[PDB]
Design a protein around this ligand. Structure first.
Ligand SMILES: Nc1nc(Nc2ccc(S(N)(=O)=O)cc2)nn1C(=O)c1c(F)cccc1F
Lengths: 20, 345
């Protein structure tokens, strides 16, 4: 499932802005 | 309705008159910014609430009133190293000037030898991000309640020639009444016409930003599409392990919706997550009214939302429940750092 894919990803925590 | 979005006059004139007065209020503060309105020693530091690239955000108590605030600390040297001087100046100048129910107030600001300090209105419910991840996803009516507040907030900000540029659940706080407050004006900018800075958060960047094209307030409307999707699905419309993989998805022109999304929700999102700027809702002849008059918002009483008269779908439990951080005492250097760069702060 797409949800399971998301939960197992490295991007489920707070996401930093790009300061370029 | 498309006919309703392209309509005047009475209700549209009421919005106009409100926004006209709001601009007058904003311009006064924009031209004469509040500066040096407190000092560090007036605040008892309680605990760390979160961290940014420039320092901790602390829960503090104002000693002479007992009021609680969130104090964002920015190490001046770190701001300089990250080439964020002008963005930080924008952030404080804009935030002290705005006034809207769904915007976090900048209550006091000041600086010392080492740091800049932004003393913010405290939201006891914490970040939407925390609740969204724990609960998994929000129902459509729940997502809609929040989305409506963002729509009105962007209508307000855009009318002042502001672009927000960092919409995400991490930057949305929930107050005691269950309503939203937009936090973090780090990338907010007042600009008529186009701008070019590659900034934002990867999952939320519009294609035109990634493609180095020159862009405007339509990037905020794209970001709203991403937010609504993430709130309703529990995951963003474009995700991967690495940013570059995310960008390829954003620019591809392709989006897949969960099977539980209503047909109205999907239609709205197709119109917000539109790569073509001449077709993106929020960026057409009818402006924000294309969004406000969309089927998905048919049940939304915009005035009632603004007045905080709608029952919130969710009020965070208050009491123990805070995220724990390792604490360290603030050291203020005996030498002024970066005085010239931050003179107007
Ligand atoms: N103004 C403001 N209020 C809060 N409230 C708050 C309450 C509890 C928690 S937690 N998860 O339990 O540690 C966190 C925050 N934050 N806040 C901010 O500007 C702020 C922000 F936008 C993002 C991150 C941290 C902040 F501090």
């Amino acid at each position: 499932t797409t949800y399971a894919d998301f939960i197992a990803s490295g991007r489920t925590g707070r996401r930093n802005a790009i300061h370029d | 309705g498309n006919a309703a979005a392209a309509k005047k006059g009475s209700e549209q004139e009421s919005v106009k008159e409100f926004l006209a007065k709001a601009k007058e209020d904003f311009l006064k503060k924009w031209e004469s910014p509040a500066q040096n309105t407190a000092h560090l020693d007036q605040f008892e530091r309680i605990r760390t609430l979160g961290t940014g690239s420039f320092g901790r955000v602390m829960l503090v108590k104002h000693k002479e009133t007992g009021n609680h605030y969130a104090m964002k600390i920015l190490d001046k040297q770190k701001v300089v190293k990250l080439k964020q001087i002008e963005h930080t100046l924008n952030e404080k100048r804009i935030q002290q000037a705005v006034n809207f129910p769904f915007l976090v107030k900048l209550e006091f600001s000041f600086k010392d030898n080492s740091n800049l300090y932004m003393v913010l209105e405290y939201a006891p419910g914490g970040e939407m991000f925390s609740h969204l991840r724990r609960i998994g996803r929000f129902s459509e009516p729940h997502a809609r309640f929040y989305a409506a507040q963002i729509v009105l907030t962007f209508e307000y900000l855009h009318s002042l020639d502001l672009i927000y540029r960092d919409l995400k659940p991490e930057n949305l706080l929930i107050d005691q009444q269950g309503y939203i407050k937009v936090a973090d004006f780090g990338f907010a900018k007042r600009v008529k016409g186009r701008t070019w800075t590659l900034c934002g958060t990867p999952e939320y960047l519009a294609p035109e930003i990634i493609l180095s094209k020159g862009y405007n307030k339509a990037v905020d409307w794209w970001a709203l599409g991403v937010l609504i999707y993430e709130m309703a699905a529990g995951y963003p419309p474009f995700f991967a392990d690495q940013p570059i993989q995310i960008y390829e998805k954003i620019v591809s022109g392709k989006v897949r919706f969960p099977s539980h999304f209503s047909s109205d929700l999907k239609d709205l999102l197709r119109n917000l997550l539109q790569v073509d700027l001449t077709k993106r809702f929020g960026n057409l002849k009818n402006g924000v009214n294309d969004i406000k008059n969309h089927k998905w918002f048919a049940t939304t009483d915009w005035i009632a939302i603004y007045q905080r008269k709608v029952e919130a779908p969710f009020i965070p439990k208050f009491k123990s429940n805070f995220d724990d951080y390792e604490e360290e005492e603030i050291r203020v250097s005996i030498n002024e750092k970066c005085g010239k760069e931050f003179s107007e702060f």
